[PDB]
Amino acid sequence: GATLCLGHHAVPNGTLVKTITDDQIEVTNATELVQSSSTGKICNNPHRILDGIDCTLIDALLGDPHCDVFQNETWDLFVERSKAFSNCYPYDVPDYASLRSLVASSGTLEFITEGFTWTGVTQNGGSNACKRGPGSGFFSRLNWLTKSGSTYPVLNVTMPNNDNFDKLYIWGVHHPSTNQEQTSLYVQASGRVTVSTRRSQQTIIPNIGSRPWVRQASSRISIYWTIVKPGDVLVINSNGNLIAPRGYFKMRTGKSSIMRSDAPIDTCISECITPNGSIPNDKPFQNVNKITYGACPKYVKQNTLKLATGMRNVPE
């Protein structure tokens, strides 16, 4: 008669996978679900990547002279480098993290100058701590006010928001090292800065005292921010120590963010970005970095997970 055998294929070198019942069992084939490698490079498409180079987002915001190239820049992803440095008047930002976040998320440094009237003070103060060309200078977006003649009057100014968008105002307060410096610059023995809207108010008293010497000064500036909504009004009131805004930053909402990375930027296309570089997004999981931006595989702790793409391998 005849014999007819039913059967299935096999291969000489199978792959091990995990199941409900077995932590290793051999199948004919599998595919990797965890992306574990990067090129080491951040692709410049399709997201608008802005390399901060020597500049933090905050220094570009304030207008540190070596960050002037960033004026009115926009981004989907601002990349901060570990080599970045400040090179202007020494400053702090109470709630630095929040200011950095909100600006990063806004995705723009578009600045609109406004005609503030500062009656009876000297404008455009600068310092050798913050050189602009050969001479002393200052943050481009801030206006250091000091006495005119022998007086610093009460400054009291308003700027209404008659636009249909939110305005972000960056301003500050100067902290002298000595009483001599305080009175020299602002006349009054103790200054005061009050910035308000209809909805909110911030009042800051300067503190006089030495801090450690940084880029020529034991003094400091502290940076604050105020958002003004359509139909609201900014009021600024001060009898000394005001580091005045020159205008506002336009705010947006959208997909913008910021990332700390030293990966070089390259000409290529990748939806997913990590600090290690761009990664492909064909796999559902990744083990490269929990910090990601874009259409990315989800971060998991496993460096490999095999999905079986074939039957059980039972060789000859």
């Binding site: 055998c5 096999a10 199948v27 910021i258 000859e316």
Partner: protein
């Protein structure tokens, strides 16, 4: 697997079969041969492609999130930020482990199942003209030249043609 064909009553696979996943080996008067079954092979592949495409389906695109590395010690708020991310990562790591485990058990069972389907279909085709040897092979109880074998494989084999002949050899 659940059906007990692959790594079960079929003792092993065929490294020689390179043109399909399941198929036939015969011995008759004219010699021996081997042919892949295309419909079983495709049923298995189609199902595996199906699940593959479901799994590699891009679901998430994220933009501004929370910070996940910190250069200074801060305490409470940072503790919470880290804990939120760690919690998330563990839940996703678990989802991934479970997913592959369930997927792979099911892939093994469904490939085992398709082998079994092909075996039961062939058995039914042969009616009373053959018997199950128990190792995935049918002893056919009549003369089955290459034309006859190809008839079983391509679905045309009329069992009534060979029934008298085969019933005789069986009993």
């Amino acid at each position: 697997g659940l059906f007990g064909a692959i790594a079960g009553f079929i003792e092993n696979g065929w490294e020689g079969m390179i043109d399909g996943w399941y198929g036939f080996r015969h011995q008759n008067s004219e010699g021996t041969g081997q042919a892949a079954d295309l419909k079983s092979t495709q049923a298995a592949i189609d199902q595996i492609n199906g699940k593959l495409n479901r799994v590699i389906e891009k679901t998430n695109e994220k933009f501004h999130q929370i910070e996940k590395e910190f250069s200074e010690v801060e305490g409470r708020i940072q503790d919470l930020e880290k804990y939120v991310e760690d919690t998330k990562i563990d839940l996703w790591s678990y989802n991934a482990e479970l997913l592959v485990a369930l997927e792979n058990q099911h892939t093994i069972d469904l490939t085992d199942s398709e082998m079994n389907k092909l075996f039961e279909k062939t058995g039914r085709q042969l009616r009373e003209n053959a018997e199950d040897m128990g190792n995935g092979c049918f002893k056919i109880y009549h003369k089955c030249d290459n034309a006859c074998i190809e008839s079983i494989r391509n679905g045309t084999y009329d069992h009534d043609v060979y029934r008298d002949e085969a019933l005789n050899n069986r009993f």
